[PDB]
A paper describes a structure:
Inositol 1,3,4,5,6-pentakisphosphate 2-kinase (IP5 2-K)3 is a key enzyme of higher inositol phosphate (inositide, IP) metabolism. IP5 2-K is present in yeast to mammals and catalyzes the synthesis of phytic acid (inositol hexakisphosphate or IP6) from IP5 and ATP. The CIP lobe represents more than half of the protein and is specific to IP5 2-K enzymes.
In addition, we present two different crystal forms, including one or two molecules in the asymmetric unit, respectively, the first showing much better resolution (2.4 versus 3.2 Å). mIP5 2-K presents two zinc ions in its structure, one in the CIP-lobe (Zn1) and the other close to the hinge region (Zn2). Regarding Zn2, it is created by two residues from the hinge (His-125 and His-129) and one residue from the C-lobe (Cys-410). Mutation of residues His-129 and Cys-410 to serine produces samples with a moderate decrease in enzymatic activity revealing that Zn2 is not critical for protein function. Therefore, Zn1 is key in all mammal IP5 2-K enzymes, whereas Zn2 could be an artifact of crystallization. Unexpectedly, the formation of the ternary complex (mIP5 2-K + IP5 + ATP) was achieved by protein incubation with IP6 and ADP.
Author numbering: 5 to 98, 103 to 220, 226 to 295, 312 to 412, 427 to 464
The structure:
Amino acid sequence: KMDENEWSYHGEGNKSLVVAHAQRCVVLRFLKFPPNKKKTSEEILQHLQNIVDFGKNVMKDFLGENYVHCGEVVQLPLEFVKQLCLKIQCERPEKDLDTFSGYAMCLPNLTRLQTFHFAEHRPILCVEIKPKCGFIPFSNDVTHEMKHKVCRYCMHQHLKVATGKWKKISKYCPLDLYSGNKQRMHFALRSLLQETQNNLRIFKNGELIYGCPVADLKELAHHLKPFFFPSNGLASGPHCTKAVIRELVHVITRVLLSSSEKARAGALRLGLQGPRVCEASPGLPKGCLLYKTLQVQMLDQLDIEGLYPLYKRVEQYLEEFPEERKTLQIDGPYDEVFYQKLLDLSTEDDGTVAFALTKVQQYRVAMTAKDCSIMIALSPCLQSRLAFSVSVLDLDLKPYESIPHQYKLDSKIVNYYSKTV
Ligand SMILES: O=P(O)(O)O[C@@H]1[C@@H](OP(=O)(O)O)[C@H](OP(=O)(O)O)[C@H](O)[C@H](OP(=O)(O)O)[C@H]1OP(=O)(O)O
Ligand SMILES: Nc1ncnc2c1ncn2[C@@H]1O[C@H](COP(=O)(O)OP(=O)(O)OP(=O)(O)O)[C@@H](O)[C@H]1O
Ligand SMILES: [Mg+2]
Ligand SMILES: [Mg+2]
Ligand SMILES: [Zn+2]
Ligand SMILES: [Zn+2]
């Protein structure tokens, strides 16, 4: 028996909606789809099963077993889904919700959990960061001038601000964060606090308390003092907002730079081609999650510019041989062989379709890693004496048909930014 009153609205990115249970530390993830065309009921089941099979097989090998969690696909009563949707409709921010299938993913609620223990903890603080792409493209295939010296995030800011999506430009550059420089990382996190956008959220015990009275720097610092300056009897005591936010920013930097005891044979060893600094504003440990995420982003070896020629070869082949879309395993299954196909890092274009297809798939995987989120969970545990857990969220492979749009959008981002100067 599923009561609709127990589940609350948790969040919503443009492709899926999440709801969280108040009692158990789990969440349910429902898909969004366009009116043209809404997917069939048995196709939804396979889509969700591919998201699990991608995270299970591909991303656990690239990032680590401890850092990825992708719970099972589950079936629910339609009457529960209809009623839960209507309640939650109210709380949406404003692509139609999956109301007719009754299929969803049951994931653990990482806002209330530690990974290494894996029970609920309280009091528990959680910082969810969306870091974006951590390098500037370096291939000779790129035409435009600005792309070699400014990262896509900073270039995308200006368009988003002018569009009206955001009010002001952020001072956050991903390359400050991904560079192992503590000083740059600290600055990157402070700017990201000052202008959150969709790139930062903070929770206390499951409840959102920061990045969408908005509100608010002082009010945040109230919730953080018990974690960072714990009064063990004595309240000594008077800590200003500046000092509280500082201890947050240090701890998050210290956490992202931490790695497990393991420093295993790197799945990816791709070197960092500069610029390591960005013209928008002023190494990283091999074991840590932030580095491993950067490496899977670097499967975009040739830029989008770039890869669109390689995409065109695979499309003219499937124009003429449409039956081979399935036989080539373009839409999975994302199994142990599929992970092996991604490890060919060679960049010569003599082999023509076998090579292009391999690179198209590597690019789909990179686009996933650029758009992924990182969750950090601070809390006391028996196994300040704060214990941490790192995790990655939002790991669903970007669809094959979005590659045209990715070219089209990047062309618009740089041309507006170059016109602006
Ligand atoms: O359009 P882009 O390249 O800026 O990236 C999209 C994001 O834009 P933003 O973070 O606002 O700059 C976009 O963010 P918002 O929906 O605007 O929060 C999504 O993360 C989207 O991912 P998905 O394809 O829905 O999984 C992202 O789409 P993909 O490009 O990853 O397909
Ligand atoms: N396992 C989880 N634990 C805690 N919070 C979660 C979990 N899964 C999802 N969320 C929250 O739900 C939000 C929205 O879900 P999600 O990002 O997965 O959907 P999306 O449409 O694919 O997003 P995006 O547009 O960023 O690609 C996330 O930003 C995250 O804060
Ligand atoms: Mg998505
Ligand atoms: Mg997300
Ligand atoms: Zn930048
Ligand atoms: Zn514990």
